[PDB]
Design a protein around this ligand. Sequence first.
Ligand SMILES: *[C@@H]1O[C@H](CO[C@@H]2O[C@@H](C)[C@@H](O)[C@@H](O)[C@@H]2O)[C@@H](O[C@@H]2O[C@H](CO)[C@@H](O)[C@H](O)[C@H]2NC(C)=O)[C@H](O)[C@H]1NC(C)=O
Ligand SMILES: *[C@@H]1O[C@H](CO[C@@H]2O[C@@H](C)[C@@H](O)[C@@H](O)[C@@H]2O)[C@@H](O[C@@H]2O[C@H](CO)[C@@H](O)[C@H](O)[C@H]2NC(C)=O)[C@H](O)[C@H]1NC(C)=O
Lengths: 99, 218
Amino acid sequence: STIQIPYTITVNGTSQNILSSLTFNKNQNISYKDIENKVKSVLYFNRGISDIDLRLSKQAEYTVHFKNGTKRVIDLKSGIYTADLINTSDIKAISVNVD
Amino acid sequence: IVGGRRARPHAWPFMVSLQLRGGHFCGATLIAPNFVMSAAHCVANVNVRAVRVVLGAHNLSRREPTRQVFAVQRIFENGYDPVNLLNDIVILQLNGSATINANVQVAQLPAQGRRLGNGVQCLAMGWGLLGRNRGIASVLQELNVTVVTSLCRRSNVCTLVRGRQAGVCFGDSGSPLVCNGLIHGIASFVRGGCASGLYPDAFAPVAQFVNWIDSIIQ
Ligand SMILES: *[C@@H]1O[C@H](CO[C@@H]2O[C@@H](C)[C@@H](O)[C@@H](O)[C@@H]2O)[C@@H](O[C@@H]2O[C@H](CO)[C@@H](O)[C@H](O)[C@H]2NC(C)=O)[C@H](O)[C@H]1NC(C)=O
Ligand SMILES: *[C@@H]1O[C@H](CO[C@@H]2O[C@@H](C)[C@@H](O)[C@@H](O)[C@@H]2O)[C@@H](O[C@@H]2O[C@H](CO)[C@@H](O)[C@H](O)[C@H]2NC(C)=O)[C@H](O)[C@H]1NC(C)=O
């Protein structure tokens, strides 16, 4: 009833050399604010980057990679959200990039 | 839709629900019996072969026999800019023609190039979140909004509810903005979370696309 979705974190060009994943509910329609909440938690937990540190970074984005080969790039400092929902079982991976 | 009300049953027979594996994810508008209009970002990343287009719906948690359900056969875009969220409109051609009755009807569009002035009264609607923490709406919701030009840009139609925190929310993308009986916007994006009260909701400006939409139905 849950699915693992792999993610990677890159901070100033250095990755983490780890295999790790996030837990989502299978086949659920969620928002990009739901996804942002999970990207921020792995930033804090794996790299020590809090909300304050994210606001003060030069650039901060994450990419949702979909299983049909497309992707969507979200700017974590924009405060803009499209008003859609996306399905958790359509997601291949998430990559986070903070410079 | 945060802070709206329930629509009357079948008061907007052009209102469409786009669903994936039985679950609503975006709105749309019926603009011909075999064509619906939505936001391009709603389909940019989905397997479009798996989208179900539900017409004549009111309570998405039930099995309403007034429903007509179609598949998507082709999509049409015209300059969609995901980076800047410009030209955020898509037309979906259905695998069939809907039967027109009291519950399922085709929307009317404005003339090409009609701009809405500051202060114009409109009606937004959708099946989106009832408020963050509260979950997706089951029964179609509608919300009175006003067109504003501050904190906006010319390539969008923006709207604001003043005095309370209200606006479109997640799942309302692609839903129509109705002003003076005509579809003038397609819900596109919010700023600073749902129903902030500071920043107006942003719609794709349908009036800029009428000649193109017409050329697609021919
Ligand atoms: C147009 O397509 C609809 C929908 O097809 C279903 O949903 C698609 C997304 C895809 O997943 C299909 O494999 C599905 O069957 C058709 O409605 C279906 O019609 C068949 C036969 O009448 C019926 O067995 C299914 O239960 C129907 N599905 C639903 C949700 O009502 C519709 O028949 C198609 N129209 C034409 C003219 O071919
Ligand atoms: C809230 O909107 C309703 C619905 O009217 C629609 O949206 C309007 C903003 C405008 O686009 C109308 O042309 C639309 O039909 C308003 O209800 C209307 O009120 C007028 C004035 O009393 C009445 O003549 C109409 O018949 C009503 N239409 C319907 C469908 O009931 C309502 O007034 C708006 N609320 C506020 C506070 O402005």
